[PDB]
Tab-separated table of C-alpha atoms in Angstrom:
chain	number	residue	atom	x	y	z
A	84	UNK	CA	0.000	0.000	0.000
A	85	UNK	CA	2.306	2.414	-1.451
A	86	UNK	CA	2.472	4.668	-4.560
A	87	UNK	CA	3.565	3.323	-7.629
A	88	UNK	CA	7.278	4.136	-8.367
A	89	UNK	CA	7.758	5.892	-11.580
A	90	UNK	CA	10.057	3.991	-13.721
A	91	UNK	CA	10.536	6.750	-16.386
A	92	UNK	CA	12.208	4.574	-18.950
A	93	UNK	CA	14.523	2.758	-16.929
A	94	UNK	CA	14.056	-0.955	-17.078
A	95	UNK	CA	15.488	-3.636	-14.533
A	96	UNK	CA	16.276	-7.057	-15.756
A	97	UNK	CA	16.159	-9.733	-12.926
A	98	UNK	CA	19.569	-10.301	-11.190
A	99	UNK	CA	20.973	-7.655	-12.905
A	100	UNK	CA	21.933	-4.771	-10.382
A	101	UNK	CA	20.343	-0.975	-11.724
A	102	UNK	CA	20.227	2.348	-10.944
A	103	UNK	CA	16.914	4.768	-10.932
A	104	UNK	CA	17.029	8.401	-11.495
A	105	UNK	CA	13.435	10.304	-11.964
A	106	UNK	CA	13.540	13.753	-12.030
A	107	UNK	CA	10.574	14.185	-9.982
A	108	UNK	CA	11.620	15.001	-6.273
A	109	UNK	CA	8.579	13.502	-4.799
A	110	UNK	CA	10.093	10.106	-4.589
A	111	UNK	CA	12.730	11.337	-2.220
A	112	UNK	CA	9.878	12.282	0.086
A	113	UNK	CA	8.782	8.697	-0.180
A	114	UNK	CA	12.125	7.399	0.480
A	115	UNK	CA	12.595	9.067	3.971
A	116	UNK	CA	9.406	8.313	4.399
A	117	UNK	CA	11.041	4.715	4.009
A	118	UNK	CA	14.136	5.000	6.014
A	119	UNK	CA	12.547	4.994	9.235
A	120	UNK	CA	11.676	1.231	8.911
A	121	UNK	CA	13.623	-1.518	10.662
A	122	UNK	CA	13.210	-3.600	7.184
A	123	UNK	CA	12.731	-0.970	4.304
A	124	UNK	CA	12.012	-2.445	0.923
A	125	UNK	CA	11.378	-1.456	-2.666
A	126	UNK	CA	9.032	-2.905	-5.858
A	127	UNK	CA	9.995	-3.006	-9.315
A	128	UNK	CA	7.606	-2.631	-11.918
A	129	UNK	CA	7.515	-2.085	-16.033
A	130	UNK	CA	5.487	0.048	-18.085
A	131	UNK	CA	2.595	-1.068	-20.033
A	132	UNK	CA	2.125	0.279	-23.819
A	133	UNK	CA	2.186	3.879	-24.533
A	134	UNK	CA	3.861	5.423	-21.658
A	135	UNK	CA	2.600	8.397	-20.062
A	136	UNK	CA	3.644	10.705	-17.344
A	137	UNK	CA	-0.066	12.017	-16.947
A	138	UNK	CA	-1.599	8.207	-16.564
A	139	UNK	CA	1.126	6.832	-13.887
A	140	UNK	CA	-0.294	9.089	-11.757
A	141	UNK	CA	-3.916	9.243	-12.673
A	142	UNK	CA	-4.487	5.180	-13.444
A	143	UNK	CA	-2.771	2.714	-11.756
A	144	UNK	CA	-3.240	0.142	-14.734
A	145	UNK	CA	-0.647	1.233	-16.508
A	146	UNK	CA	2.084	-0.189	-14.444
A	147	UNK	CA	2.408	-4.143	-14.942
A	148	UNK	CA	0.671	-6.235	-12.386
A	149	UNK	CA	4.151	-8.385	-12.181
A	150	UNK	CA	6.374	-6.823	-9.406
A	151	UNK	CA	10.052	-7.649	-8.447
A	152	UNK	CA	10.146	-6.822	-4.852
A	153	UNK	CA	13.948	-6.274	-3.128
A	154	UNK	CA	15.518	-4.299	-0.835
A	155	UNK	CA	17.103	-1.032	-0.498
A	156	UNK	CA	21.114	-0.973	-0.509
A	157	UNK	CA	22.394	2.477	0.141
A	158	UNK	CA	21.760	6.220	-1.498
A	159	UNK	CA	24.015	8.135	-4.077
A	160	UNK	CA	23.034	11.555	-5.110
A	161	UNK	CA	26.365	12.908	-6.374
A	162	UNK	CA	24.735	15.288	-8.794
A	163	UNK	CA	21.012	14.640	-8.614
A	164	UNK	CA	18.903	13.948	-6.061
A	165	UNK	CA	17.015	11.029	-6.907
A	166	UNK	CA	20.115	7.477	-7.489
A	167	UNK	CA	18.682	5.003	-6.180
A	168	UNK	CA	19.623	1.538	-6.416
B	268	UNK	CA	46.641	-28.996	-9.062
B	269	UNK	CA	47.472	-31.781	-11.579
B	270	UNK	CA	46.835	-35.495	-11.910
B	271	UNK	CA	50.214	-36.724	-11.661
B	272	UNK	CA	50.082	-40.299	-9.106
B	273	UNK	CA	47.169	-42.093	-8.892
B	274	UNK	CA	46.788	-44.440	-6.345
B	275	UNK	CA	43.996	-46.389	-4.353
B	276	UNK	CA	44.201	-46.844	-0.714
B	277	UNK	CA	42.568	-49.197	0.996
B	278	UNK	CA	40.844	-47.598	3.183
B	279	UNK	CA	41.290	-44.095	4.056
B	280	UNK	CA	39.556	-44.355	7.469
B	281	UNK	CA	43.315	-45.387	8.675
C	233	UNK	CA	-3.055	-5.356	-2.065
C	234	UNK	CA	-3.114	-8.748	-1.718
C	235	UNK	CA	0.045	-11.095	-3.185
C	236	UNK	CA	1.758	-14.270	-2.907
C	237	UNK	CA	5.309	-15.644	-4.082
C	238	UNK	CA	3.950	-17.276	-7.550
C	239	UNK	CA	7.700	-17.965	-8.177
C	240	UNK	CA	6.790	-21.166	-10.324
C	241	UNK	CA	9.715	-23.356	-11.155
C	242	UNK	CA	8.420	-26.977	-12.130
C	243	UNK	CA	10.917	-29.176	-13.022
C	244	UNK	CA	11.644	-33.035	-14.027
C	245	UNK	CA	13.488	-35.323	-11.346
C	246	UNK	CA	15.613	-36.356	-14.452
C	247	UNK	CA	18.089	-33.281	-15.079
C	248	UNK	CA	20.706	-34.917	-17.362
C	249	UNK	CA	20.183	-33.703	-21.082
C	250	UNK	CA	18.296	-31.322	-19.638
C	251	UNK	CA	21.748	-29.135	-19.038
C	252	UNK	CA	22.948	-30.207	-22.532
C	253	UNK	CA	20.667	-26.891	-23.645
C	254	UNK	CA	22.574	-24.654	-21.151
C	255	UNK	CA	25.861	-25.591	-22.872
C	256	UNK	CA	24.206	-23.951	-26.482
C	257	UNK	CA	23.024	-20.771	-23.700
C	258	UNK	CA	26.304	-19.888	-22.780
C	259	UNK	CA	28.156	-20.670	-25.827
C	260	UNK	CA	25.842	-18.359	-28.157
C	261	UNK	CA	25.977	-16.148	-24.810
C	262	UNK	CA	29.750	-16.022	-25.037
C	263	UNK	CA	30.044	-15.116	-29.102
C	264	UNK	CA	27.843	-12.347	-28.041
C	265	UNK	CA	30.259	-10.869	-25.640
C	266	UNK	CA	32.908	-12.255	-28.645
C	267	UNK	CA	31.183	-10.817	-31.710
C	268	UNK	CA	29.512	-8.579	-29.733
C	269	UNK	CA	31.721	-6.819	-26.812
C	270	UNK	CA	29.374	-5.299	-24.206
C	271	UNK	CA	30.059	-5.798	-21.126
C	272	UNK	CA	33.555	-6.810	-19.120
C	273	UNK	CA	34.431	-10.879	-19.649
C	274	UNK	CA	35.398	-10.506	-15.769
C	275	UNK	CA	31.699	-11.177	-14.762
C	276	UNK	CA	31.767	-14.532	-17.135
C	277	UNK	CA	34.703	-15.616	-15.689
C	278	UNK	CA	33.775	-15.724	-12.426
C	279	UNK	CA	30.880	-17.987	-13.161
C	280	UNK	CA	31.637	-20.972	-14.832
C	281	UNK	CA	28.872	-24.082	-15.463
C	282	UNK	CA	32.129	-26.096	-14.418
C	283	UNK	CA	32.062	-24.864	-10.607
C	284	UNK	CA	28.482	-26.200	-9.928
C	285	UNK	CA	28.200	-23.270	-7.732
C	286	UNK	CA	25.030	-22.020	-9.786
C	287	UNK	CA	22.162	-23.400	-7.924
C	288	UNK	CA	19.357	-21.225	-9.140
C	289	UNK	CA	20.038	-21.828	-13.102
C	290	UNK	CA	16.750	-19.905	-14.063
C	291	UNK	CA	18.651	-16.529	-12.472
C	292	UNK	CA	21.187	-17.766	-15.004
C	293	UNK	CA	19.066	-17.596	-18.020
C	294	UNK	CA	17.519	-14.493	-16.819
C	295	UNK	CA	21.019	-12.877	-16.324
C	296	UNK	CA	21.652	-13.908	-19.897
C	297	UNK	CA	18.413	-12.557	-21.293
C	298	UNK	CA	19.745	-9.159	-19.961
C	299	UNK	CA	21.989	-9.040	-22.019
C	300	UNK	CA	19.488	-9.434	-24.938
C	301	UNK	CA	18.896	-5.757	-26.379
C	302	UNK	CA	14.829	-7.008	-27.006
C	303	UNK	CA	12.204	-4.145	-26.740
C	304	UNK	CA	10.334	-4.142	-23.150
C	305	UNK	CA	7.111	-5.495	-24.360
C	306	UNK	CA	9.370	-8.371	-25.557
C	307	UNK	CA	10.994	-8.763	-21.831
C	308	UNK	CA	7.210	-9.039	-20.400
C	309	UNK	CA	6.453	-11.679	-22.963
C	310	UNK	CA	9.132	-14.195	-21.986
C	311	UNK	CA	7.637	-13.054	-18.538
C	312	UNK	CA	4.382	-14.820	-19.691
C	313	UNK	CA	5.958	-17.947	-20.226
C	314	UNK	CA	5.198	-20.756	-17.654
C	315	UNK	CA	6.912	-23.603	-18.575
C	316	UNK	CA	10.237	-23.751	-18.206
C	317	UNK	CA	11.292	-25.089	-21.918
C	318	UNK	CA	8.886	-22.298	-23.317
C	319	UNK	CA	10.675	-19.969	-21.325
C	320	UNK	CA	14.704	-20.940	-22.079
C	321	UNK	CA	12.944	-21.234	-25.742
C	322	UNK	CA	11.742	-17.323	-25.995
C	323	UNK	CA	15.358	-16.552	-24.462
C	324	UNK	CA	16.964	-18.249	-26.957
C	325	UNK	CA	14.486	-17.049	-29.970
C	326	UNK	CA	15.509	-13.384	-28.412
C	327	UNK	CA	19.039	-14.432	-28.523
C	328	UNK	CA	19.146	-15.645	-32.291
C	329	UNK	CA	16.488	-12.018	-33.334
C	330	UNK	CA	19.297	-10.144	-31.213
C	331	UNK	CA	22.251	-12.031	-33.730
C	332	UNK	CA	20.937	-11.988	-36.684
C	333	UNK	CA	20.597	-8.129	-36.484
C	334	UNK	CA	24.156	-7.874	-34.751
C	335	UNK	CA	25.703	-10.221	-37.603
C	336	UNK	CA	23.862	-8.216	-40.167
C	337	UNK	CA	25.681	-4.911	-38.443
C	338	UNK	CA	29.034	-6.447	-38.542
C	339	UNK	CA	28.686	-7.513	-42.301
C	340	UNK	CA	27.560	-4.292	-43.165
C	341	UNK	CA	30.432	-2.710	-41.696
C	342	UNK	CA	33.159	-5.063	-43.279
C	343	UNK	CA	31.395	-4.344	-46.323
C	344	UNK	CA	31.732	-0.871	-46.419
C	345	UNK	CA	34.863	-0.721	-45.629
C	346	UNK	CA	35.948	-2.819	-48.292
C	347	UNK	CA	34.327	-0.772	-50.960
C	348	UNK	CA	36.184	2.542	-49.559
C	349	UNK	CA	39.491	-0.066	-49.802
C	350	UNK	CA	38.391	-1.007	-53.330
C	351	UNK	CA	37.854	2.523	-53.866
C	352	UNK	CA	41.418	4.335	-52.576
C	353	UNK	CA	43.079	1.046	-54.484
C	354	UNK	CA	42.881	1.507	-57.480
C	355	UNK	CA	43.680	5.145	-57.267
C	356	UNK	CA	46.824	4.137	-55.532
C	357	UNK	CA	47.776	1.982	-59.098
C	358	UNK	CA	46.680	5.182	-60.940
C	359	UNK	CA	49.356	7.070	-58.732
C	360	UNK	CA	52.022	4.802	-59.724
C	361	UNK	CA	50.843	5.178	-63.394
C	362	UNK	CA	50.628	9.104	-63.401
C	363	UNK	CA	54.185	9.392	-61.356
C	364	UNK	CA	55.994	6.741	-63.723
C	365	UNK	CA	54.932	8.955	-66.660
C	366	UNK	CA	55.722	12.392	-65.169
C	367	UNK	CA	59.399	11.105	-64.605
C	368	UNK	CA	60.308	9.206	-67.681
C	369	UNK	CA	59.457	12.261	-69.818
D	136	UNK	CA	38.168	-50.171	-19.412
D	137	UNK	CA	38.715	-49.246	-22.827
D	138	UNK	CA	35.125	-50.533	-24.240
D	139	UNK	CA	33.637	-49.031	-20.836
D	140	UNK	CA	34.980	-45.632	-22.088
D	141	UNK	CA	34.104	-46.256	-25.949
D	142	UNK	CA	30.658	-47.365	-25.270
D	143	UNK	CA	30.265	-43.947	-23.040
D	144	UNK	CA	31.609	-41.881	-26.178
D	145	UNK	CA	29.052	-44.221	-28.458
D	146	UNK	CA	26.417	-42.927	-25.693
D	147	UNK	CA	27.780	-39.523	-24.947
D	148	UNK	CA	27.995	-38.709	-28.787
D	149	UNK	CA	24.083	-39.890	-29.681
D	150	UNK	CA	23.397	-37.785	-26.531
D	151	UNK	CA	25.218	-34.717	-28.867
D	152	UNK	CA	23.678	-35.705	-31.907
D	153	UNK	CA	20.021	-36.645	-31.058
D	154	UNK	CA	20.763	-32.861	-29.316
D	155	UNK	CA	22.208	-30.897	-32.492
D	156	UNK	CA	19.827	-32.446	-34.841
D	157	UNK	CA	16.427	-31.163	-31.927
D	158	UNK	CA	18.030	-28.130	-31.927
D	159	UNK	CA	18.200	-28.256	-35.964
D	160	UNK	CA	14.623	-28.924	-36.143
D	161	UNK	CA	13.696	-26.442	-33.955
D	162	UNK	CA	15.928	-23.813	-35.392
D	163	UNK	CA	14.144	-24.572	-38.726
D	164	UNK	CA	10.692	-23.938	-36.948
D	165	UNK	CA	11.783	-20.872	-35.978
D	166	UNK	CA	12.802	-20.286	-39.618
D	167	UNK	CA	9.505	-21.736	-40.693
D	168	UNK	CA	8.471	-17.571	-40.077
D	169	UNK	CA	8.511	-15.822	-43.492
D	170	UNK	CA	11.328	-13.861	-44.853
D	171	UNK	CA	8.637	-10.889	-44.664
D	172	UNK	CA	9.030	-10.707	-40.931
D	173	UNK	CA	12.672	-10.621	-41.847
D	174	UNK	CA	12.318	-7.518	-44.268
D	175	UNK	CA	9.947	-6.052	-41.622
D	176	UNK	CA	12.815	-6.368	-39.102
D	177	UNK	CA	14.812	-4.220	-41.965
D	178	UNK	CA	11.883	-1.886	-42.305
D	179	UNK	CA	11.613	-0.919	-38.547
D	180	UNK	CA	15.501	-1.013	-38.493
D	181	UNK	CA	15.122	2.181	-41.580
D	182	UNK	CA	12.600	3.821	-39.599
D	183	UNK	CA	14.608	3.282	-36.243
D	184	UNK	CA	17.548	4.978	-38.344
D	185	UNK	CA	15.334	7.656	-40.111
D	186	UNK	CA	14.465	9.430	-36.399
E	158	UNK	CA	48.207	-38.446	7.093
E	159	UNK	CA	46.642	-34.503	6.142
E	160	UNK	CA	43.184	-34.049	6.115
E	161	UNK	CA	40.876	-34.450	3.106
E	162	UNK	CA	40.640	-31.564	0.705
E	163	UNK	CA	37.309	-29.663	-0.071
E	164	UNK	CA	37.010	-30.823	-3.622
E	165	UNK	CA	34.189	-28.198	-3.686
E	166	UNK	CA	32.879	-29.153	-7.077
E	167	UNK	CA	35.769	-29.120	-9.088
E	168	UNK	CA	36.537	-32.745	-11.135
E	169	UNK	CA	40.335	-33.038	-12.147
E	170	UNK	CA	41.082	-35.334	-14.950
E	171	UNK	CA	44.414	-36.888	-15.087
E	172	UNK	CA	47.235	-34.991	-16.663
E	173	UNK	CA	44.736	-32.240	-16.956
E	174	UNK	CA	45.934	-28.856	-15.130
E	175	UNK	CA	43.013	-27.321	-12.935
E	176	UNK	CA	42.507	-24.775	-10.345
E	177	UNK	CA	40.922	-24.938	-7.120
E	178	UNK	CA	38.898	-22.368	-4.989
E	179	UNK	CA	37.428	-23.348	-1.935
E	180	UNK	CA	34.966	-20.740	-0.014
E	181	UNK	CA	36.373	-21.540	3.540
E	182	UNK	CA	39.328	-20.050	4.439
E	183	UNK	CA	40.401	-22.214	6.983
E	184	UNK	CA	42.398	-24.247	4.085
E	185	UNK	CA	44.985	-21.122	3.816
E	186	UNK	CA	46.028	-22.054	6.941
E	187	UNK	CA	46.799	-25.662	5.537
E	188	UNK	CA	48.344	-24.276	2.656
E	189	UNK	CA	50.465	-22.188	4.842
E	190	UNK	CA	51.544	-25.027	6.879
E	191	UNK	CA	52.737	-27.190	3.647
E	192	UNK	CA	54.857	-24.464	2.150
F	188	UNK	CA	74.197	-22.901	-63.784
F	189	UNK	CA	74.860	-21.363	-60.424
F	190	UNK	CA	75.716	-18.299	-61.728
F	191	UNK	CA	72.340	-18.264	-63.626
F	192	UNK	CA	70.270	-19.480	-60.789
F	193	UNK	CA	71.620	-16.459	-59.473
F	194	UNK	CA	71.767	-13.878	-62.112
F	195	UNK	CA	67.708	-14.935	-62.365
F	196	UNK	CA	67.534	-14.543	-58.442
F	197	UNK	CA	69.260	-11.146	-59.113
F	198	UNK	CA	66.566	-10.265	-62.287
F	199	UNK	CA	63.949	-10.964	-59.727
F	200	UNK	CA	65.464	-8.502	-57.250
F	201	UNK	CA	65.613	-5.399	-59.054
F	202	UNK	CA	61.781	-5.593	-59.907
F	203	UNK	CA	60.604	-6.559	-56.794
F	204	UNK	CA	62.874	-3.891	-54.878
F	205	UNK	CA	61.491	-1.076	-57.051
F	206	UNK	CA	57.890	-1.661	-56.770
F	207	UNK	CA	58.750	-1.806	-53.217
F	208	UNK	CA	60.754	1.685	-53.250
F	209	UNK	CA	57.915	3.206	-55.603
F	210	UNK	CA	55.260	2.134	-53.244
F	211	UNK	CA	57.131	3.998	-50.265
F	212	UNK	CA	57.449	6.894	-52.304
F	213	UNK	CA	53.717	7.045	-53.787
F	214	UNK	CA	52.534	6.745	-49.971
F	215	UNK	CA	55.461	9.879	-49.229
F	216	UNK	CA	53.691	11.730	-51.869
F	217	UNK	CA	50.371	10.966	-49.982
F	218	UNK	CA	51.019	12.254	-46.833
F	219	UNK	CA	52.904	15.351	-48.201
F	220	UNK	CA	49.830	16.224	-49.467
F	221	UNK	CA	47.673	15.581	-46.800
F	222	UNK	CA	49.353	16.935	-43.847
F	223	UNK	CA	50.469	20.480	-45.545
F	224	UNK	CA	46.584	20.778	-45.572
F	225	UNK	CA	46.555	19.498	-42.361
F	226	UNK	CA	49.181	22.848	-41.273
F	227	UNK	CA	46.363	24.550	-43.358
F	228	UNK	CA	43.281	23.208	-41.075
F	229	UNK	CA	44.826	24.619	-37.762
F	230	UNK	CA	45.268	27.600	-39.446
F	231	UNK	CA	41.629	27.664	-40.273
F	232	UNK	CA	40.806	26.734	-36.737
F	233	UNK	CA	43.462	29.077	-34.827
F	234	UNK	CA	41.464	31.885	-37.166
F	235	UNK	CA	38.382	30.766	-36.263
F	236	UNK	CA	38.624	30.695	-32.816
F	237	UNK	CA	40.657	34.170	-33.103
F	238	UNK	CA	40.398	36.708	-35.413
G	273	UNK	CA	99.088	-17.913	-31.367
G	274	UNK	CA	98.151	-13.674	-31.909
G	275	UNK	CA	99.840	-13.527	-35.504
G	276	UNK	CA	98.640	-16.428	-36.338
G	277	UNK	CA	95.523	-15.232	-36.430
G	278	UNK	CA	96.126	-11.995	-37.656
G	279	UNK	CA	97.905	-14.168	-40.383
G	280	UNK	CA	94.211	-16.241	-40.675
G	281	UNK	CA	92.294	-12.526	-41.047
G	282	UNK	CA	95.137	-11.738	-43.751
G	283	UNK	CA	94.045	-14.443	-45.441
G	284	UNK	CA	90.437	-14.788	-44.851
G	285	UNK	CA	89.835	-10.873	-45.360
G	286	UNK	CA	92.238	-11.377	-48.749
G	287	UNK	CA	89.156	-14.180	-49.955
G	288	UNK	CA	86.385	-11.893	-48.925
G	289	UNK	CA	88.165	-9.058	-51.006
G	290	UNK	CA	88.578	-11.096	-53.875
G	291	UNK	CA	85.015	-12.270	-53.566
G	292	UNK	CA	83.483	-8.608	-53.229
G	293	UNK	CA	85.812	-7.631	-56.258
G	294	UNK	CA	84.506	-10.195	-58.656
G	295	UNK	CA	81.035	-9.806	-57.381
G	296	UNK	CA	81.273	-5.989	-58.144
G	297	UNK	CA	82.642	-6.641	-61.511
G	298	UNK	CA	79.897	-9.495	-62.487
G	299	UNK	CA	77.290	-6.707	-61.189
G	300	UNK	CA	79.168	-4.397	-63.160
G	301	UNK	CA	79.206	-6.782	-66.467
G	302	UNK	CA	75.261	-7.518	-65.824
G	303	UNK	CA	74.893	-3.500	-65.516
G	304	UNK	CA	76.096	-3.182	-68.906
G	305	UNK	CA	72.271	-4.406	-70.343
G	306	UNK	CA	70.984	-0.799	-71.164
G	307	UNK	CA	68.719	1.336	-69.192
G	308	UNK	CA	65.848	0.740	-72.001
G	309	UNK	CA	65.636	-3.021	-70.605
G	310	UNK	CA	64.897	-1.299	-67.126
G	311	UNK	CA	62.737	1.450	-68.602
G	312	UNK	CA	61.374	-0.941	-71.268
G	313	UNK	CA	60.340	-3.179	-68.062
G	314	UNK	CA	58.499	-0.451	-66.562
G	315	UNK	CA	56.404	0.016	-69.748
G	316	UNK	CA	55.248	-3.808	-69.759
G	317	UNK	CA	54.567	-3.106	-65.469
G	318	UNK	CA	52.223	-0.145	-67.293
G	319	UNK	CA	50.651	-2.864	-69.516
G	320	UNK	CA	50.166	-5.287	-66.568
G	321	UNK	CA	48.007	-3.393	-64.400
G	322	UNK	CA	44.451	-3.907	-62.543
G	323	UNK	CA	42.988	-0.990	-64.763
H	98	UNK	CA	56.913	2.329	17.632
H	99	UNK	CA	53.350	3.199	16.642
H	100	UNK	CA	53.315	6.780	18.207
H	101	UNK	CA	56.747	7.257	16.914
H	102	UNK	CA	55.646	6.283	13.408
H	103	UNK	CA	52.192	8.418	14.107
H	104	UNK	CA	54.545	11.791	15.118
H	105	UNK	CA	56.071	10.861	11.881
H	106	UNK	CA	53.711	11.045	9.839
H	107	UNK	CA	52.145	14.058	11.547
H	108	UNK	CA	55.133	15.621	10.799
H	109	UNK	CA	55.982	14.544	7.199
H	110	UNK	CA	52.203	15.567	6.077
H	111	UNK	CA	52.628	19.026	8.070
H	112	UNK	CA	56.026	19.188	5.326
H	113	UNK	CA	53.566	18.057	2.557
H	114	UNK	CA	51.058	20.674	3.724
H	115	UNK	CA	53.732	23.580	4.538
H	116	UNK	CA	55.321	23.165	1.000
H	117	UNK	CA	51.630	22.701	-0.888
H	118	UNK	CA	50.665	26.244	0.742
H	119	UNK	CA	53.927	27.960	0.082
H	120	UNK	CA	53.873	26.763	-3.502
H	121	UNK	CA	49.934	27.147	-3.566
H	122	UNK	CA	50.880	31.100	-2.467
H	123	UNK	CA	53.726	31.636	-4.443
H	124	UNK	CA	51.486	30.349	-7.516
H	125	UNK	CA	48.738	33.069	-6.300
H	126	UNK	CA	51.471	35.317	-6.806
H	127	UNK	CA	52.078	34.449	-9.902
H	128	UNK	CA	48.130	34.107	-10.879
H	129	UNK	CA	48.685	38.069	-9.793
H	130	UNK	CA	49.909	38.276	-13.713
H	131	UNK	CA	47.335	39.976	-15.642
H	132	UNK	CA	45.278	38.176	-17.988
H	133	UNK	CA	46.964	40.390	-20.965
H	134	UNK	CA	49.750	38.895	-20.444
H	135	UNK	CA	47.808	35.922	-21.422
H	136	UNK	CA	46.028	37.024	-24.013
H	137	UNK	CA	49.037	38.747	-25.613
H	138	UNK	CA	50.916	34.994	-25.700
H	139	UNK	CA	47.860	33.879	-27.648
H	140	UNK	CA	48.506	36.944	-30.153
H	141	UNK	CA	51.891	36.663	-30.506
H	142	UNK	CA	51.145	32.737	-31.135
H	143	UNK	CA	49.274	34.321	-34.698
H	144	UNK	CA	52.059	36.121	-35.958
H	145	UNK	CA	53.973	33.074	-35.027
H	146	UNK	CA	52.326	30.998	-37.000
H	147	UNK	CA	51.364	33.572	-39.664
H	148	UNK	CA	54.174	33.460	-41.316
């Protein structure tokens, strides 16, 4: 019961280590709201046909029903403010 | 490491 | 939202030739990385079908369909696939659609460079010819 | 020893062959697709290139 | 009269050169003890 | 025959050793070319930037 | 021992002399075929020529 | 032997700092140079290769 990361063209194979950079801030608010949990953890989704800013957020069919749950590792943010792993 | 000697001991236990 | 670990993985007790298709994997896998130089040969050295050390070999196929530069909607449809044969099948179709436009890349290049060869050649005989007659009156 | 080991090659090698000629037939059901999806590979690699 | 090695996975055929790595490191201290 | 063996060894020589030297001397004649413009191109640049 | 083998490098360099001179006058006797064998050479290089 | 070695290296790395801020100043002090002086090396670099 969380909001729906947004991908924004950056796929994640299985077993196959990635990095994430939207330029949206509001996923750093979501991430501290995150790091206060003894056992944080992160999904990873795809995107469905057509992709589209303006539906992620409205309809939350767009986003694949698969998920690839995992944990967190550690942040970056050398020049933006968004690298996560 | 290399197969150089075989050998077969009898029982390995002693 | 409701969920639940469908991580399906059916298998047959007999796993003998079963393998024999992993040794095609890894050897089309490796004239990728040969014909095709991506990524470091460090990471395929360290893992070796050799070692036995690869317990989950479905993370193995799935590490070498990452490799495979196959459009996303093509990534969810080998996620469709159930069975594990069907599966290691789309992986391997992927791998062959990913080679045949590679090889066709290659080729092309060879080609043209041969034709800008064939090209400066025969001006280079031409050079001989004009020089030889310039000096010898 | 030595028929042990030729009579595992005998077996080892159908394993091999009964292996490359499946893969053979199923390579050639993959080609069994028409050469148009092959020239419609080349006509979305044009328009991938005319972007 | 040593103990048994952790073959680990790792056949070696005869007169075929081979390398071993072993993920406990308590065999460096055997190997340190037959130099 | 020696001395013919040798004398043919010899007619041999001389043509191979000047389509060798002309070769070197074509590809000379290349690069002079080339590289004066080359002077020329950072001029054009060193003007370009400057002036 | 010493002259003796100053005596051997008399000798031996005396051979080698002899050798170089009649090598540099069977050069010279093959040099006496004209120039229009060398340049009439390069005309049948112009005839055999990819182009 | 550790303290000793410790003072050491206190000491060596307050040489390695003492010499990086003298030569860090004394290159401040030559930064003082205008930038004409820069500017007229790139000119004179024209006429030197204008020629």
């Amino acid at each position: 019961h969380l909001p729906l990361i947004a991908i924004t063209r950056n796929p994640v194979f299985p077993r196959f280590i990635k990095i994430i950079e939207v330029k949206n801030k509001k996923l750093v608010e979501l991430l501290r709201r995150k790091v206060r949990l003894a056992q944080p953890y992160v999904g990873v989704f795809l995107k469905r046909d057509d992709s589209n800013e303006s539906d992620v957020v409205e309809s939350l069919d767009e986003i694949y029903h698969t998920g690839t749950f995992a944990q967190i590792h550690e942040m970056q943010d050398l020049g933006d403010k968004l690298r996560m792993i | 490491v290399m197969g150089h000697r075989r050998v077969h001991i009898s029982r390995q236990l002693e | 939202m409701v969920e639940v670990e469908n991580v399906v993985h059916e298998d047959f007790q007999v796993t003998e030739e079963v393998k024999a298709l992993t040794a095609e994997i890894v050897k089309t896998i490796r004239d990728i990385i040969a014909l095709n130089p991506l990524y470091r040969e460090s990471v395929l050295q360290m893992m070796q079908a050799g070692q036995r050390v690869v317990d989950n070999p479905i993370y193995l196929s799935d590490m070498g369909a990452a490799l495979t530069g196959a459009e996303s909607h093509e990534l969810q449809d080998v996620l469709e696939e159930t069975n594990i044969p069907k599966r290691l099948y789309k992986a391997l179709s992927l791998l062959k659609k990913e080679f045949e436009l590679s090889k066709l890349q290659q080729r092309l290049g060879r080609e043209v460079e041969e034709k800008i060869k064939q090209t400066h050649r025969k001006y280079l005989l031409q050079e001989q010819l004009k020089i030889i007659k310039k000096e010898l009156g």
